Design a protein. Structure first.
Ligand SMILES: OC[C@H]1O[C@H](O)[C@H](O)[C@@H](O)[C@@H]1O
Ligand SMILES: OC[C@H]1O[C@H](O)[C@H](O)[C@@H](O)[C@@H]1O
Ligand SMILES: OC[C@H]1O[C@H](O)[C@H](O)[C@@H](O)[C@@H]1O
Ligand SMILES: [Zn+2]
Ligand SMILES: [Zn+2]
Lengths: 285, 285
């Protein structure tokens, strides 16, 4: 399922929700965990310091963070969770992270994103954005607030040629995971656009007809996988509207998106409006 | 100076601060203005509509927006400001925009960014980010709040090999513009990092010494251009700290940044914290 998870350690605080998520997963689906932290002190480049001194600072930071990470993780290690700690020196974390993924062939990246308030959107940093856009493996952004009780997984699917295969991957992988992880109920959503009242003046047959195709496309899919109709949703509106309203209404613990350095308009507009975890999945091909 | 400006029309509202900025500029530095608006209605792809109907909708939206833009801009046209209106059909605005730039060899892109409240950061959309990262020409993000009275231009410069040339371009271009535009006073800032109290335990000689180099580097530069020392700043801290504190303290109307799809850490971290216009300049080479 995901046997090789990379958790990106957040240097700015002791608690590591991304690691906590990784352990939660491990104990249910197996798989190894690399707890990975790239750091730097720019003062590492400022003929102002000795060569020896540059080294002692660089080596001293590696050792200290490693022990700190091990302190955070002690219970998980003593519990016998297979966690490898890698702190590395690198000035560009997202590049560091993506090179680690490729080197260690990681099949999942987990990284914390902060939500300051329950009313608001999860804050995605620039690093987060570079990951989401560019990281080859799937990327799971782990909101630092509690998982809603009985929270659902919501998968956005595209309903309007080979987009068929991408949709299939997305639903396949989400289902195999939700089923080995506490049987989280999985829902599907497709939003269809209704023509702005503005564009109109250039026919509400449009409405029923488009609603028609999408329902057909949803069913075909639902059924390639024996999904219940009741967990499948076909909605009028902008994706960035529909998906987070439906997330709130469903108490979705996570939203799962598949991609088109650019995720496609749906994903770009949506991601900035999420109030729960995000999982981004790119076509492996 | 900038003889070929592209203003990205914001479809979501009537008032166009980016165009208003473009006119403001024109009447002081000359140059032509293309008022550019890419649009689409996804319903344009949904065998659900006639070929004729797809066209009538597509052609009808082009014509209507064109007249709307002309309505917004009437006073500027009647005033005799040289404004070409281009509305085009394209599903990816940032791609549309960047292709227009290359096609029309635009030397400046202006586009509005919204600040919801004076206390907060200007909201950069995903499109804004793609532009800032990828658009070949300079990109001027025009905050939709008033320009501070006597507002200054603040230029971030790098102070720690060929970074010399990039710095030079940045200061040259900002100065030639501020001087033909109302003589906006230009300031320079370089921030130097102080080693976290945390990294320490692995010498406040560091402090004075690093402060030293940067002052030397600042002066060399200031003086390649006969800049007053009093408008030049060398500060301890994170760039994302120093630059917006100094912006607030200075009443800087705009912050000018030069780049390293990635602007370099300084620019990435800073941009998300700005409370004023932004101008991004990439090495032409
Ligand atoms: O949204 C404001 C954010 O800005 C700062 O980085 C704060 O330290 C963080 O707690 C907060 O959520
Ligand atoms: O979508 C592009 C994103 O790039 C940046 O990293 C910003 O953190 C965010 O405001 C923006 O939305
Ligand atoms: O920050 C919240 C923003 O969200 C919405 O897009 C609002 O319409 C805009 O007025 C506001 O500034
Ligand atoms: Zn917070
Ligand atoms: Zn607002």
């Amino acid at each position: 399922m995901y046997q090789n998870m990379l958790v990106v350690i957040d240097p700015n605080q002791d608690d590591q929700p991304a690691l906590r998520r990784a352990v939660y997963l491990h104990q249910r689906i197996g798989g190894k965990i690399k707890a990975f932290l790239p750091i730097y002190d720019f003062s590492y480049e400022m003929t102002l310091l000795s060569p020896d001194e540059r080294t002692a600072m660089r080596q001293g930071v590696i050792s200290q963070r490693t022990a700190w990470i091990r302190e955070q993780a002690k219970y998980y290690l003593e519990a016998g969770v297979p966690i490898e700690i890698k702190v590395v020196w690198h000035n560009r974390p997202f590049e560091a992270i993506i090179q680690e993924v490729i080197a260690g062939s990681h099949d999942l990246v987990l990284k914390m994103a902060h939500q300051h308030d329950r009313l608001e959107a999860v804050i995605f940093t620039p690093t987060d954005w570079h990951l989401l856009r560019k990281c080859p493996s799937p990327v799971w952004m782990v909101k630092d607030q509690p998982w809603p009780e009985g929270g659902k997984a919501l998968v956005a699917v595209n309903l309007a040629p080979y987009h068929n295969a991408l949709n299939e991957k997305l639903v396949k992988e989400t289902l195999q995971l939700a089923e080995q992880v506490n049987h989280t109920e999985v829902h599907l959503v497709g939003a269809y656009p209704v023509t702005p009242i503005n564009i109109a003046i250039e026919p509400s047959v449009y409405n029923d007809a488009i609603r028609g195709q999408h329902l057909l496309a949803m069913k075909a899919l639902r059924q390639k996988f024996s999904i219940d109709e009741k967990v499948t949703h076909v909605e009028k509106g902008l994706p960035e509207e529909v998906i987070p309203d439906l997330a709130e209404h469903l108490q979705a613990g996570i939203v799962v998106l598949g991609t088109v350095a650019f995720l496609g308009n749906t994903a770009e507009q949506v991601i900035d409006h999420l109030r729960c975890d995000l999982l981004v999945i790119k076509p492996d091909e």
